[PDB]
Design an enzyme around this catalytic site. Structure first.
Site, short mmCIF file in Angstrom:
data_model
loop_
_atom_site.label_atom_id
_atom_site.label_comp_id
_atom_site.label_asym_id
_atom_site.label_seq_id
_atom_site.Cartn_x
_atom_site.Cartn_y
_atom_site.Cartn_z
N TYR B 7 0.82 -1.05 -0.18
CA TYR B 7 0.02 0.01 -0.04
C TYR B 7 0.84 1.32 -0.13
O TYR B 7 2.12 1.15 -0.02
CB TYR B 7 -0.94 -0.06 1.31
N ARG B 13 -6.58 2.84 3.46
CA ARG B 13 -7.61 1.51 3.37
C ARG B 13 -6.90 0.09 3.95
O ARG B 13 -7.39 -0.73 4.16
CB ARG B 13 -7.95 1.26 2.04
N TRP B 103 -10.52 11.37 -2.55
CA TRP B 103 -9.08 11.15 -2.23
C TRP B 103 -8.06 11.46 -3.37
O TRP B 103 -6.86 11.96 -2.88
CB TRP B 103 -8.71 9.83 -1.55
N1 LIG Z 1 -12.55 -0.44 -2.36
C1 LIG Z 1 -11.04 -0.81 -2.64
C2 LIG Z 1 -10.52 0.52 -3.05
C3 LIG Z 1 -8.93 0.30 -3.47
C4 LIG Z 1 -8.58 1.92 -3.98
O1 LIG Z 1 -9.34 2.56 -4.58
N2 LIG Z 1 -7.29 2.12 -3.52
C5 LIG Z 1 -6.51 3.20 -4.13
C6 LIG Z 1 -5.58 3.83 -3.21
S1 LIG Z 1 -6.50 4.45 -1.61
C7 LIG Z 1 -5.92 3.11 -5.42
O2 LIG Z 1 -5.47 1.63 -5.77
N3 LIG Z 1 -6.12 3.96 -6.41
C8 LIG Z 1 -4.87 4.66 -7.08
C9 LIG Z 1 -5.28 4.15 -8.41
O3 LIG Z 1 -6.29 3.46 -8.73
O4 LIG Z 1 -4.45 4.40 -9.56
C10 LIG Z 1 -10.56 -1.41 -1.45
O5 LIG Z 1 -11.08 -1.34 -0.21
O6 LIG Z 1 -9.19 -1.88 -1.47
O1 LIG Z 2 -5.71 9.41 2.58
N1 LIG Z 2 -6.51 8.56 1.70
O2 LIG Z 2 -5.61 8.45 0.74
C1 LIG Z 2 -7.37 7.61 2.27
C2 LIG Z 2 -8.06 6.93 1.35
C3 LIG Z 2 -8.97 6.11 1.66
C4 LIG Z 2 -9.31 6.08 3.03
C5 LIG Z 2 -10.87 5.21 3.28
C6 LIG Z 2 -11.45 4.40 2.33
C7 LIG Z 2 -12.25 3.91 3.16
N2 LIG Z 2 -11.78 3.70 4.25
N3 LIG Z 2 -10.64 4.55 4.47
C8 LIG Z 2 -8.66 6.66 3.98
C9 LIG Z 2 -7.60 7.36 3.68
#
Ligand SMILES: N[C@@H](CCC(=O)N[C@@H](CS)C(=O)NCC(=O)O)C(=O)O
Ligand SMILES: O=[N+]([O-])c1ccc(-c2cc[nH]n2)cc1
Ligand SMILES: N[C@@H](CCC(=O)N[C@@H](CS)C(=O)NCC(=O)O)C(=O)O
Lengths: 198, 198
Positions: B7, B13, B103
């Site tokens: 992460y 998360r 975010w």
């Molecule tokens: N619902 C998923 C959300 C995962 C997610 O949206 N993670 C973000 C980081 S907080 C991410 O990988 N986004 C960066 C991207 O998609 O390029 C979980 O709980 O794992």
């Molecule tokens: O700071 N952030 O990037 C971040 C992103 C997602 C969460 C999140 C989503 C669901 N539960 N917590 C908390 C902090």
């Protein structure tokens, strides 16, 4: 047990629960409300959202939490704790995407523009990810149907209403939809369920 | 099994997974990546999102799916099938709210506005709902701690960063956070973990 499902007259977020009851041959009251009944129902609810499921009078909420609870100790949940993890993850991935849509948007032009952007960029990306994850396998997880396949069929049914050609380059994903729809309990349910756009 | 969690360098998360490893006294590699290296790792992932958890030679994704897997048949899961449903439902309610935050919004003015709106207009109602739901019980679900309590503590910690006064009218919810933070394994982790804003 005595089960009562409450939601709007729509597939929406309650449909996954409805498929599970159908598949497991579990009887329940399928209560559908009109908006006028909502304010009063809502005020009685700890978190004020639907669907809810009343089990012998005790109220449960959160559609996916409910779906998981119903598949508990059945093959639909996944055959091992590891497969259950993959099942939960696929469900979450699909839910994450469906939550992107501005379902309650009041400006019709904004709604149309956002749907189009999501269906042009995000949806095809997810379809390719899903298609490659499924590969040439029979079901999304393991070697038998799980509620993740049900959720795929349900989510895609809704997406197809807005972009009919979405799966035109994904025959493997179409084949998955057909396999879920052909399960006798599911086929029966799809035939008798109230017809609604969403 | 050998566990490797990937992460960003933040609670975010992945934190729920980190509390679960701590509580269950399971050693794991806490892998934290820099932004610049993300696009490269993202391209190799089936669904392009983090956190991911590599167990032996298997990759797992979706934070809550992972949390659900790790807590299955442990004392962190609900004590009955129905309690398990309530654990999942409270987590989903908290998750639904936290995922509403943009975010990843690059326009700072647009981001701050949406944050302020969610914190000022929506967050107080969730607190009201949770306060009422908890009532006078020691824990959110049943008579012992569950990973929903962990998730509450984690989510509220982040919410308090942006809105310090959020729990001023909710002493019972402050008491719950303190109870969770008092759990020895959790206290130990809170003390030693990288101290990041989010
Ligand atoms: N619902 C998923 C959300 C995962 C997610 O949206 N993670 C973000 C980081 S907080 C991410 O990988 N986004 C960066 C991207 O998609 O390029 C979980 O709980 O794992
Ligand atoms: O700071 N952030 O990037 C971040 C992103 C997602 C969460 C999140 C989503 C669901 N539960 N917590 C908390 C902090
Ligand atoms: N993640 C929750 C979402 C619950 C939810 O947002 N329900 C909507 C209907 S689809 C609702 O009741 N919102 C309108 C309202 O409560 O006034 C679930 O799946 O149950």
């Amino acid at each position: 047990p005595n089960y009562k499902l409450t939601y709007f007259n729509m597939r929406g977020r309650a449909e996954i629960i409805r498929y599970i009851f159908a598949y497991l041959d579990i009887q329940y009251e399928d209560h559908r409300i009109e908006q006028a009944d909502w304010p009063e129902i809502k005020s009685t609810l700890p978190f004020g959202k639907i669907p809810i499921l009343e089990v012998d009078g005790l109220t449960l909420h959160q559609s996916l939490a409910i779906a998981r609870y119903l598949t508990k100790n059945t093959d639909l949940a996944g055959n091992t704790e590891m497969e259950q993890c993959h099942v939960d993850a696929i469900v979450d991935t699909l839910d994450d995407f469906m939550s992107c849509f501005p379902w309650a948007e009041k400006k019709q032009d904004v709604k149309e523009q956002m749907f189009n952007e999501l269906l042009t960029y995000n949806a095809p990306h997810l379809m390719q990810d899903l298609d490659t994850y499924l590969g040439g396998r029979e079901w999304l997880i393991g070697n038998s149907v799980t509620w993740a396949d049900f959720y795929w069929e349900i989510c895609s049914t809704t997406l197809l209403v807005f972009k009919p050609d979405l799966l035109d380059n994904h025959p493997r994903l179409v084949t998955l939809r057909k396999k879920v729809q052909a399960i006798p309990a599911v086929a029966n349910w799809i035939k008798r369920r109230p017809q609604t756009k969403l």
